[PDB]
Amino acid sequence: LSKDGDLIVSMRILGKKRTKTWHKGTLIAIQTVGPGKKYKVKFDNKGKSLLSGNHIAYDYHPPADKLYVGSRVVAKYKDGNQVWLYAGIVAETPNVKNKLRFLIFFDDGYASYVTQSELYPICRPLKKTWEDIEDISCRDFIEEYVTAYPNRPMVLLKSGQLIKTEWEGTWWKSRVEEVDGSLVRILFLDDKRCEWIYRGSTRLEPMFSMK
Amino acid sequence: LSKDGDLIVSMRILGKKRTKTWHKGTLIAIQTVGPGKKYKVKFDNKGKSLLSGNHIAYDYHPPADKLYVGSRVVAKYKDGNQVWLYAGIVAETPNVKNKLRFLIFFDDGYASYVTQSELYPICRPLKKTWEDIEDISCRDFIEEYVTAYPNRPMVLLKSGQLIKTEWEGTWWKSRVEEVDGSLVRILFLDDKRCEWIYRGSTRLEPMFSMK
Numbered sequence: 001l002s003k004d005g006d007l008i009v010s011m012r013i014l015g016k017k018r019t020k021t022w023h024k025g026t027l028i029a030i031q032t033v034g035p036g037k038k039y040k041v042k043f044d045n046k047g048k049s050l051l052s053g054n055h056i057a058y059d060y061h062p063p064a065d066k067l068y069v070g071s072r073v074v075a076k077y078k079d080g081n082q083v084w085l086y087a088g089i090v091a092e093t094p095n096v097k098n099k100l101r102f103l104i105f106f107d108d109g110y111a112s113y114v115t116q117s118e119l120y121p122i123c124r125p126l127k128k129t130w131e132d133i134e135d136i137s138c139r140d141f142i143e144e145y146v147t148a149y150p151n152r153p154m155v156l157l158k159s160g161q162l163i164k165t166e167w168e169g170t171w172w173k174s175r176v177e178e179v180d181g182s183l184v185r186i187l188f189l190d191d192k193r194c195e196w197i198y199r200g201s202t203r204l205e206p207m208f209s210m211k
Numbered sequence: 212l213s214k215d216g217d218l219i220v221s222m223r224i225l226g227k228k229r230t231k232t233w234h235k236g237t238l239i240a241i242q243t244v245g246p247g248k249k250y251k252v253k254f255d256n257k258g259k260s261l262l263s264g265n266h267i268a269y270d271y272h273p274p275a276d277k278l279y280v281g282s283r284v285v286a287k288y289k290d291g292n293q294v295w296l297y298a299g300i301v302a303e304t305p306n307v308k309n310k311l312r313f314l315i316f317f318d319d320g321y322a323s324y325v326t327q328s329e330l331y332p333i334c335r336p337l338k339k340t341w342e343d344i345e346d347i348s349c350r351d352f353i354e355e356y357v358t359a360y361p362n363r364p365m366v367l368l369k370s371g372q373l374i375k376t377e378w379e380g381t382w383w384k385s386r387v388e389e390v391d392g393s394l395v396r397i398l399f400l401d402d403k404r405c406e407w408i409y410r411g412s413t414r415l416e417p418m419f420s421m422k
Protein backbone atom coordinates (compact mmCIF):
# COMPACT_ATOMS: atom_id res chain seq x y z
CA LEU A 1 0.00 0.00 0.00
CA SER A 2 0.83 3.71 -0.46
CA LYS A 3 -2.50 5.35 0.50
CA ASP A 4 -5.33 4.47 2.85
CA GLY A 5 -7.94 7.18 2.86
CA ASP A 6 -5.97 10.40 3.23
CA LEU A 7 -3.06 8.62 4.94
CA ILE A 8 -0.22 8.71 2.44
CA VAL A 9 3.44 7.80 2.86
CA SER A 10 5.86 10.73 3.39
CA MET A 11 3.09 12.79 5.03
CA ARG A 12 3.65 14.58 8.33
CA ILE A 13 1.78 13.03 11.25
CA LEU A 14 1.64 12.75 15.02
CA GLY A 15 2.32 9.45 16.77
CA LYS A 16 1.85 8.17 20.30
CA LYS A 17 5.07 6.94 21.94
CA ARG A 18 5.16 4.18 24.56
CA THR A 19 5.60 6.98 27.10
CA LYS A 20 2.05 8.16 26.21
CA THR A 21 3.16 11.58 24.97
CA TRP A 22 2.65 12.20 21.25
CA HIS A 23 5.39 13.34 18.85
CA LYS A 24 5.72 14.54 15.27
CA GLY A 25 7.21 12.38 12.58
CA THR A 26 6.59 10.95 9.13
CA LEU A 27 4.40 8.12 7.93
CA ILE A 28 6.99 5.92 6.23
CA ALA A 29 4.88 2.80 5.57
CA ILE A 30 1.43 1.31 5.77
CA GLN A 31 0.99 -2.39 6.63
CA THR A 32 -2.00 -4.67 6.21
CA VAL A 33 -2.68 -6.62 9.43
CA GLY A 34 -5.63 -8.93 8.86
CA PRO A 35 -8.95 -7.06 8.68
CA GLY A 36 -7.31 -3.63 8.85
CA LYS A 37 -4.07 -1.72 8.56
CA LYS A 38 -1.27 -0.42 10.77
CA TYR A 39 0.76 2.74 10.24
CA LYS A 40 4.54 2.96 10.62
CA VAL A 41 5.87 6.26 11.94
CA LYS A 42 9.45 7.49 12.11
CA PHE A 43 9.64 10.19 14.73
CA ASP A 44 11.48 13.46 14.29
CA ASN A 45 12.92 12.78 17.80
CA LYS A 46 14.47 9.40 16.90
CA GLY A 47 12.39 6.28 17.20
CA LYS A 48 10.09 4.16 15.07
CA SER A 49 6.71 2.65 15.81
CA LEU A 50 4.09 0.59 14.07
CA LEU A 51 0.79 2.03 15.26
CA SER A 52 -2.90 1.42 14.94
CA GLY A 53 -5.08 4.14 13.43
CA ASN A 54 -6.22 5.41 16.80
CA HIS A 55 -2.61 6.08 17.88
CA ILE A 56 -1.82 8.59 15.15
CA ALA A 57 -3.27 11.99 14.63
CA TYR A 58 -3.17 14.53 11.84
CA ASP A 59 -0.70 17.40 11.98
CA TYR A 60 -3.41 20.03 11.63
CA HIS A 61 -6.00 21.62 13.86
CA PRO A 62 -9.56 20.39 13.18
CA PRO A 63 -12.42 22.72 12.34
CA ALA A 64 -14.32 23.44 15.53
CA ASP A 65 -17.52 22.11 13.96
CA LYS A 66 -16.43 18.53 13.41
CA LEU A 67 -15.70 18.46 17.15
CA TYR A 68 -18.43 17.01 19.34
CA VAL A 69 -18.68 15.75 22.89
CA GLY A 70 -16.88 12.42 22.75
CA SER A 71 -14.41 13.39 20.01
CA ARG A 72 -10.98 11.76 20.26
CA VAL A 73 -8.20 14.30 20.18
CA VAL A 74 -4.64 15.04 21.02
CA ALA A 75 -4.21 18.27 23.00
CA LYS A 76 -1.39 20.52 24.12
CA TYR A 77 -0.57 20.36 27.83
CA LYS A 78 1.63 23.14 29.26
CA ASP A 79 3.66 21.78 32.22
CA GLY A 80 5.21 25.14 32.94
CA ASN A 81 7.95 25.73 30.38
CA GLN A 82 7.67 22.44 28.44
CA VAL A 83 4.69 21.73 26.16
CA TRP A 84 3.58 18.13 25.69
CA LEU A 85 1.04 16.40 23.49
CA TYR A 86 -1.34 14.01 25.22
CA ALA A 87 -4.54 12.27 24.27
CA GLY A 88 -8.03 12.84 25.58
CA ILE A 89 -11.71 13.33 24.85
CA VAL A 90 -13.63 16.52 24.13
CA ALA A 91 -15.89 17.09 27.12
CA GLU A 92 -17.33 20.52 26.20
CA THR A 93 -17.48 22.51 22.97
CA PRO A 94 -17.11 26.31 22.83
CA ASN A 95 -19.83 28.46 24.37
CA VAL A 96 -20.38 31.58 26.42
CA LYS A 97 -19.94 29.95 29.82
CA ASN A 98 -16.54 28.45 28.99
CA LYS A 99 -15.47 31.54 26.98
CA LEU A 100 -15.49 29.77 23.58
CA ARG A 101 -13.10 26.96 24.61
CA PHE A 102 -12.92 23.17 24.52
CA LEU A 103 -12.92 21.23 27.76
CA ILE A 104 -10.53 18.26 27.45
CA PHE A 105 -10.57 15.20 29.68
CA PHE A 106 -7.18 13.66 29.17
CA ASP A 107 -6.48 9.95 29.33
CA ASP A 108 -4.74 10.33 32.72
CA GLY A 109 -7.74 12.02 34.36
CA TYR A 110 -6.50 15.61 34.06
CA ALA A 111 -8.87 18.27 32.79
CA SER A 112 -8.24 21.58 31.03
CA TYR A 113 -9.70 24.24 28.73
CA VAL A 114 -7.94 24.66 25.37
CA THR A 115 -8.51 26.39 22.03
CA GLN A 116 -9.03 24.86 18.58
CA SER A 117 -5.42 25.73 17.83
CA GLU A 118 -4.17 23.41 20.60
CA LEU A 119 -6.02 20.31 19.30
CA TYR A 120 -5.29 17.57 16.78
CA PRO A 121 -7.79 14.99 15.50
CA ILE A 122 -6.93 11.37 15.97
CA CYS A 123 -6.97 9.74 12.53
CA ARG A 124 -9.04 6.60 13.19
CA PRO A 125 -10.82 6.73 16.53
CA LEU A 126 -12.84 3.78 17.69
CA LYS A 127 -16.60 3.63 17.27
CA LYS A 128 -16.94 4.11 21.02
CA THR A 129 -14.16 6.66 21.45
CA TRP A 130 -13.39 5.95 25.13
CA GLU A 131 -12.61 2.27 24.56
CA ASP A 132 -8.89 2.81 23.98
CA ILE A 133 -8.53 4.69 27.28
CA GLU A 134 -6.10 2.42 29.09
CA ASP A 135 -6.73 3.51 32.67
CA ILE A 136 -9.93 1.74 33.64
CA SER A 137 -11.16 4.21 36.22
CA CYS A 138 -10.73 7.02 33.68
CA ARG A 139 -12.30 5.03 30.89
CA ASP A 140 -15.37 4.38 33.04
CA PHE A 141 -15.84 8.02 34.01
CA ILE A 142 -15.60 9.07 30.35
CA GLU A 143 -18.13 6.43 29.32
CA GLU A 144 -20.58 7.53 32.04
CA TYR A 145 -19.96 11.19 31.20
CA VAL A 146 -20.53 10.81 27.47
CA THR A 147 -23.50 8.49 27.97
CA ALA A 148 -25.29 10.77 30.46
CA TYR A 149 -23.90 13.59 28.57
CA PRO A 150 -26.11 16.60 28.55
CA ASN A 151 -26.71 15.63 32.20
CA ARG A 152 -23.66 16.91 34.11
CA PRO A 153 -23.97 17.08 37.88
CA MET A 154 -21.68 19.77 39.25
CA VAL A 155 -21.13 21.49 42.55
CA LEU A 156 -21.43 25.26 43.10
CA LEU A 157 -18.22 26.66 44.61
CA LYS A 158 -17.27 30.21 45.50
CA SER A 159 -13.83 31.73 45.80
CA GLY A 160 -12.53 31.60 49.37
CA GLN A 161 -14.78 28.66 50.25
CA LEU A 162 -13.07 26.09 52.45
CA ILE A 163 -13.57 22.42 51.48
CA LYS A 164 -11.84 19.10 51.62
CA THR A 165 -10.35 17.72 48.41
CA GLU A 166 -9.17 14.17 47.79
CA TRP A 167 -5.64 13.38 46.67
CA GLU A 168 -4.09 9.94 46.64
CA GLY A 169 -6.72 8.41 48.94
CA THR A 170 -6.46 11.18 51.58
CA TRP A 171 -8.87 14.08 52.12
CA TRP A 172 -7.00 17.37 52.50
CA LYS A 173 -7.97 20.78 53.80
CA SER A 174 -8.21 23.11 50.86
CA ARG A 175 -9.60 26.35 49.57
CA VAL A 176 -11.32 27.40 46.38
CA GLU A 177 -9.13 29.98 44.63
CA GLU A 178 -10.99 30.53 41.41
CA VAL A 179 -13.78 29.17 39.23
CA ASP A 180 -13.37 28.98 35.42
CA GLY A 181 -16.44 27.48 33.74
CA SER A 182 -16.63 23.79 34.68
CA LEU A 183 -13.33 23.81 36.51
CA VAL A 184 -12.26 25.09 39.86
CA ARG A 185 -8.74 25.88 40.95
CA ILE A 186 -8.16 24.34 44.35
CA LEU A 187 -5.40 25.31 46.76
CA PHE A 188 -4.28 22.53 49.09
CA LEU A 189 -3.40 24.19 52.37
CA ASP A 190 -0.87 21.71 53.72
CA ASP A 191 1.67 22.10 50.91
CA LYS A 192 0.28 25.17 49.04
CA ARG A 193 -0.12 23.14 45.81
CA CYS A 194 -2.72 24.23 43.26
CA GLU A 195 -4.74 22.05 40.95
CA TRP A 196 -7.60 22.57 38.52
CA ILE A 197 -10.46 20.10 39.01
CA TYR A 198 -13.68 19.42 37.15
CA ARG A 199 -16.61 20.61 39.26
CA GLY A 200 -18.39 17.28 38.79
CA SER A 201 -15.48 15.32 40.30
CA THR A 202 -16.08 13.33 43.48
CA ARG A 203 -12.63 14.39 44.66
CA LEU A 204 -14.39 17.57 45.76
CA GLU A 205 -16.06 16.80 49.12
CA PRO A 206 -19.36 18.59 48.34
CA MET A 207 -19.58 16.51 45.20
CA PHE A 208 -18.61 13.37 47.07
CA SER A 209 -21.41 13.89 49.56
CA MET A 210 -24.18 14.92 47.08
CA LYS A 211 -23.61 11.44 45.55
CA LEU B 212 -1.75 -18.35 48.57
CA SER B 213 -1.02 -15.23 50.62
CA LYS B 214 2.80 -15.10 50.88
CA ASP B 215 5.71 -14.83 48.47
CA GLY B 216 8.94 -13.91 50.17
CA ASP B 217 8.16 -10.68 52.03
CA LEU B 218 5.26 -9.90 49.69
CA ILE B 219 2.38 -10.62 52.05
CA VAL B 220 -1.31 -9.86 51.54
CA SER B 221 -2.68 -6.72 53.27
CA MET B 222 0.76 -5.11 53.08
CA ARG B 223 1.15 -1.58 51.81
CA ILE B 224 2.78 -1.34 48.40
CA LEU B 225 3.40 0.90 45.39
CA GLY B 226 1.86 -0.11 42.08
CA LYS B 227 2.39 1.14 38.53
CA LYS B 228 -0.75 2.42 36.82
CA ARG B 229 -1.43 2.27 33.11
CA THR B 230 -0.52 5.97 32.92
CA LYS B 231 3.05 5.05 34.03
CA THR B 232 2.87 6.92 37.28
CA TRP B 233 2.98 4.92 40.54
CA HIS B 234 0.53 5.09 43.44
CA LYS B 235 0.24 3.67 46.91
CA GLY B 236 -2.16 0.84 47.57
CA THR B 237 -2.74 -2.47 49.29
CA LEU B 238 -1.61 -5.87 48.15
CA ILE B 239 -4.94 -7.71 48.23
CA ALA B 240 -4.00 -10.95 46.45
CA ILE B 241 -1.33 -13.12 44.85
CA GLN B 242 -2.18 -15.12 41.71
CA THR B 243 -0.27 -17.72 39.75
CA VAL B 244 -0.14 -16.94 36.02
CA GLY B 245 1.96 -19.10 33.71
CA PRO B 246 5.33 -19.83 35.37
CA GLY B 247 5.15 -16.97 37.87
CA LYS B 248 3.08 -14.86 40.25
CA LYS B 249 1.14 -11.67 39.66
CA TYR B 250 0.11 -9.30 42.47
CA LYS B 251 -3.31 -7.70 42.81
CA VAL B 252 -3.10 -4.09 44.08
CA LYS B 253 -6.03 -1.99 45.25
CA PHE B 254 -4.91 1.63 44.97
CA ASP B 255 -5.56 4.17 47.71
CA ASN B 256 -6.77 6.65 45.09
CA LYS B 257 -9.12 4.44 43.04
CA GLY B 258 -8.70 1.30 40.90
CA LYS B 259 -7.23 -2.23 41.13
CA SER B 260 -4.57 -3.92 38.99
CA LEU B 261 -3.02 -7.36 38.64
CA LEU B 262 0.64 -6.46 38.30
CA SER B 263 3.81 -8.39 37.66
CA GLY B 264 6.51 -8.19 40.31
CA ASN B 265 8.53 -5.55 38.46
CA HIS B 266 5.47 -3.26 38.43
CA ILE B 267 5.23 -3.02 42.22
CA ALA B 268 7.59 -1.46 44.71
CA TYR B 269 7.95 -1.45 48.46
CA ASP B 270 6.57 1.33 50.62
CA TYR B 271 9.98 2.18 52.17
CA HIS B 272 13.17 3.94 51.09
CA PRO B 273 15.95 1.44 50.39
CA PRO B 274 19.19 1.10 52.35
CA ALA B 275 21.67 3.21 50.40
CA ASP B 276 24.07 0.25 50.76
CA LYS B 277 21.75 -1.88 48.63
CA LEU B 278 21.61 0.35 45.52
CA TYR B 279 23.98 -0.03 42.64
CA VAL B 280 24.29 1.26 39.10
CA GLY B 281 21.53 -0.74 37.41
CA SER B 282 19.10 -0.80 40.35
CA ARG B 283 15.45 -0.62 39.28
CA VAL B 284 13.70 2.01 41.38
CA VAL B 285 10.77 4.35 41.65
CA ALA B 286 11.74 7.99 42.18
CA LYS B 287 9.98 11.18 43.08
CA TYR B 288 9.66 13.60 40.19
CA LYS B 289 8.92 17.21 41.21
CA ASP B 290 7.14 19.54 38.73
CA GLY B 291 7.62 22.48 41.05
CA ASN B 292 4.67 22.03 43.36
CA GLN B 293 3.40 18.61 42.17
CA VAL B 294 5.12 15.32 43.09
CA TRP B 295 4.85 12.18 40.98
CA LEU B 296 6.31 8.66 41.28
CA TYR B 297 7.98 7.34 38.15
CA ALA B 298 10.20 4.35 37.38
CA GLY B 299 13.87 4.57 36.48
CA ILE B 300 17.40 3.17 36.84
CA VAL B 301 20.15 4.24 39.23
CA ALA B 302 22.90 5.70 37.02
CA GLU B 303 25.15 7.04 39.81
CA THR B 304 25.35 6.52 43.54
CA PRO B 305 26.38 9.25 45.99
CA ASN B 306 29.88 10.64 45.79
CA VAL B 307 31.74 13.91 46.30
CA LYS B 308 31.37 15.08 42.69
CA ASN B 309 27.56 14.70 42.67
CA LYS B 310 27.00 16.20 46.15
CA LEU B 311 26.01 12.82 47.63
CA ARG B 312 22.96 12.26 45.42
CA PHE B 313 21.66 9.39 43.30
CA LEU B 314 21.40 10.08 39.58
CA ILE B 315 18.24 8.50 38.14
CA PHE B 316 17.63 7.70 34.48
CA PHE B 317 13.84 7.54 34.25
CA ASP B 318 12.00 5.27 31.78
CA ASP B 319 10.84 8.26 29.68
CA GLY B 320 14.45 9.44 29.10
CA TYR B 321 14.57 12.17 31.73
CA ALA B 322 17.40 12.45 34.27
CA SER B 323 17.65 13.98 37.75
CA TYR B 324 19.54 13.78 41.01
CA VAL B 325 17.63 12.61 44.07
CA THR B 326 18.23 11.73 47.71
CA GLN B 327 17.74 8.28 49.30
CA SER B 328 14.47 9.54 50.77
CA GLU B 329 13.05 10.04 47.28
CA LEU B 330 13.51 6.40 46.19
CA TYR B 331 11.53 3.23 46.45
CA PRO B 332 12.87 -0.17 45.42
CA ILE B 333 11.07 -2.29 42.83
CA CYS B 334 10.01 -5.58 44.40
CA ARG B 335 10.99 -8.06 41.64
CA PRO B 336 13.16 -6.48 38.96
CA LEU B 337 14.24 -8.34 35.88
CA LYS B 338 17.63 -10.01 35.82
CA LYS B 339 18.53 -7.50 33.17
CA THR B 340 16.92 -4.52 34.89
CA TRP B 341 16.45 -2.44 31.70
CA GLU B 342 14.54 -5.14 29.90
CA ASP B 343 11.19 -3.78 31.05
CA ILE B 344 11.91 -0.26 29.83
CA GLU B 345 9.17 0.21 27.23
CA ASP B 346 10.61 3.06 25.15
CA ILE B 347 13.21 1.26 23.03
CA SER B 348 15.57 4.23 22.57
CA CYS B 349 15.67 4.70 26.36
CA ARG B 350 16.08 0.98 26.89
CA ASP B 351 19.02 0.76 24.46
CA PHE B 352 20.68 3.78 26.00
CA ILE B 353 20.37 2.30 29.49
CA GLU B 354 21.60 -1.15 28.45
CA GLU B 355 24.70 0.40 26.84
CA TYR B 356 25.20 2.61 29.87
CA VAL B 357 24.81 -0.05 32.55
CA THR B 358 26.79 -2.59 30.52
CA ALA B 359 29.57 -0.06 29.87
CA TYR B 360 29.40 1.17 33.35
CA PRO B 361 32.26 2.91 35.10
CA ASN B 362 33.02 4.11 31.56
CA ARG B 363 30.97 7.35 31.60
CA PRO B 364 31.68 9.32 28.40
CA MET B 365 30.50 12.91 28.89
CA VAL B 366 31.34 16.31 27.52
CA LEU B 367 32.79 19.07 29.57
CA LEU B 368 30.78 22.31 29.53
CA LYS B 369 31.06 25.73 31.16
CA SER B 370 28.47 28.29 32.19
CA GLY B 371 27.77 30.64 29.26
CA GLN B 372 28.93 28.24 26.54
CA LEU B 373 26.90 28.49 23.34
CA ILE B 374 26.02 25.16 21.74
CA LYS B 375 23.33 23.54 19.70
CA THR B 376 20.97 21.23 21.59
CA GLU B 377 18.50 18.85 19.96
CA TRP B 378 14.77 18.88 20.72
CA GLU B 379 12.13 17.01 18.74
CA GLY B 380 14.36 16.41 15.70
CA THR B 381 15.68 20.01 15.50
CA TRP B 382 18.98 21.48 16.74
CA TRP B 383 18.39 24.74 18.56
CA LYS B 384 20.76 27.53 19.47
CA SER B 385 21.22 27.31 23.22
CA ARG B 386 23.39 28.25 26.20
CA VAL B 387 24.84 26.42 29.18
CA GLU B 388 23.33 28.08 32.25
CA GLU B 389 24.47 25.66 34.95
CA VAL B 390 26.49 22.51 35.60
CA ASP B 391 25.38 20.25 38.47
CA GLY B 392 27.46 17.08 38.49
CA SER B 393 26.66 14.92 35.45
CA LEU B 394 23.78 17.19 34.43
CA VAL B 395 23.79 20.55 32.68
CA ARG B 396 20.96 23.10 32.49
CA ILE B 397 20.42 24.28 28.93
CA LEU B 398 18.60 27.45 27.96
CA PHE B 399 16.99 27.19 24.55
CA LEU B 400 17.08 30.69 23.06
CA ASP B 401 14.49 30.84 20.22
CA ASP B 402 11.76 30.36 22.88
CA LYS B 403 13.53 30.67 26.32
CA ARG B 404 12.82 27.15 27.73
CA CYS B 405 15.22 25.69 30.30
CA GLU B 406 15.95 21.98 30.54
CA TRP B 407 18.18 19.65 32.55
CA ILE B 408 20.20 17.23 30.42
CA TYR B 409 22.74 14.49 31.02
CA ARG B 410 26.21 15.49 29.86
CA GLY B 411 26.55 12.13 28.10
CA SER B 412 23.48 12.73 25.98
CA THR B 413 23.87 13.03 22.21
CA ARG B 414 21.28 15.78 22.27
CA LEU B 415 24.26 18.00 23.20
CA GLU B 416 26.02 18.79 19.93
CA PRO B 417 29.56 18.47 21.37
CA MET B 418 28.65 14.94 22.50
CA PHE B 419 26.79 14.13 19.31
CA SER B 420 30.01 15.13 17.52
CA MET B 421 32.46 13.47 19.94
CA LYS B 422 34.55 10.80 18.22
Ligand SMILES: CN1C[C@H](Nc2nc3cc[nH]c3c(=O)n2C)C[C@H](c2ccccc2)C1
Nearest residue numbers: 021077079084086106108109110195196293
Ligand atom coordinates in the same frame (compact mmCIF):
# COMPACT_ATOMS: atom_id res chain seq x y z
C1 LIG C 1 -2.16 15.33 30.77
N1 LIG C 1 -1.38 14.96 31.64
C2 LIG C 1 -1.32 15.92 32.71
C3 LIG C 1 -0.36 15.41 33.83
N2 LIG C 1 -0.42 16.49 34.80
C4 LIG C 1 -1.49 16.45 35.78
N3 LIG C 1 -2.38 15.30 35.82
C5 LIG C 1 -3.45 15.27 36.83
C6 LIG C 1 -4.43 14.34 37.10
C7 LIG C 1 -5.18 14.85 38.25
N4 LIG C 1 -4.65 15.99 38.60
C8 LIG C 1 -3.55 16.29 37.76
C9 LIG C 1 -2.58 17.46 37.72
O1 LIG C 1 -2.68 18.39 38.51
N5 LIG C 1 -1.57 17.52 36.70
C10 LIG C 1 -0.67 18.60 36.64
C11 LIG C 1 1.06 15.29 33.36
C12 LIG C 1 1.00 14.42 32.23
C13 LIG C 1 2.41 14.27 31.56
C14 LIG C 1 2.71 13.01 31.09
C15 LIG C 1 3.94 12.84 30.48
C16 LIG C 1 4.82 13.93 30.31
C17 LIG C 1 4.49 15.19 30.78
C18 LIG C 1 3.25 15.33 31.39
C19 LIG C 1 0.01 14.84 31.11
Ligand SMILES: CN1C[C@H](Nc2nc3cc[nH]c3c(=O)n2C)C[C@H](c2ccccc2)C1
Nearest residue numbers: 082231232288295297317319320321406407
Ligand atom coordinates in the same frame (compact mmCIF):
# COMPACT_ATOMS: atom_id res chain seq x y z
C1 LIG D 1 9.95 11.36 34.56
N1 LIG D 1 9.17 11.95 33.82
C2 LIG D 1 9.62 13.29 33.52
C3 LIG D 1 8.67 14.05 32.55
N2 LIG D 1 9.23 15.40 32.45
C4 LIG D 1 10.33 15.62 31.51
N3 LIG D 1 10.80 14.52 30.70
C5 LIG D 1 11.91 14.78 29.76
C6 LIG D 1 12.53 13.93 28.87
C7 LIG D 1 13.57 14.75 28.23
N4 LIG D 1 13.50 15.99 28.71
C8 LIG D 1 12.48 16.06 29.67
C9 LIG D 1 11.98 17.20 30.55
O1 LIG D 1 12.45 18.34 30.54
N5 LIG D 1 10.91 16.91 31.46
C10 LIG D 1 10.38 17.92 32.30
C11 LIG D 1 7.27 14.08 33.08
C12 LIG D 1 6.88 12.73 33.41
C13 LIG D 1 5.43 12.68 34.01
C14 LIG D 1 4.62 11.63 33.65
C15 LIG D 1 3.34 11.58 34.18
C16 LIG D 1 2.91 12.56 35.07
C17 LIG D 1 3.74 13.62 35.42
C18 LIG D 1 5.01 13.67 34.89
C19 LIG D 1 7.81 12.07 34.44
